[PDB]
Design a protein around this ligand. Structure first.
Ligand SMILES: [Cl-]
Lengths: 76, 76, 76
């Protein structure tokens, strides 16, 4: 049914949001590690494109609320 | 039609799953590279937040099967 | 309505595509940083699994056009 397709979509998006959140966290831990290494070479994060930045696209707020709204709409 | 919207959604999700899988793999290769560098400074991965961990959110199993179920449901 | 579910889905996918694009960019900047460090140890990217590669799964073209087609179809 349409409820079928819809519920599959939200289930799937749920899993995918959680994997992407997890990916982002790892990338930022990786960047922090990199900056410690640059430090130990006597270099600052400014010596490497992007390495000072820890404010990635983080539309996490927006996505969680829309996801909730979608579920509540799709499964009620 | 609804089949239209649905088939666009699964096509798109297909591409996105493949890009996210690929991203995760790269992040884990990046972390492995980092740990080799920490090693060469005489440090262990325990000296850097997260650097020992290679078990990221990996709901890949779950997502592939739901994706398959969605396609088969959406396009049959 | 179905337009409801649909418009929520595209809004959400929009945010997610933008976050994933942003993630990928960061991972590639992280890899570039890593390679500079390997260099400073007298090693080439060939000494570390994946570190030479900057051509990640990048189905960005395909996804943007399908996303556009989906919106135009879903919200018209
Ligand atoms: Cl990374």
């Amino acid at each position: 049914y349409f409820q079928g397709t819809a519920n599959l979509t939200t289930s799937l998006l749920g899993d995918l949001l959680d994997d992407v959140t997890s990916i982002r966290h790892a990338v930022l831990q990786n960047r922090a590690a990199i900056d410690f290494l640059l430090l130990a070479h006597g270099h600052g994060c400014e010596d490497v494109a992007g390495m000072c930045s820890f404010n990635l696209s983080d539309q996490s707020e927006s996505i969680q609320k829309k996801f909730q709204l979608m579920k509540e709409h799709v499964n009620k």
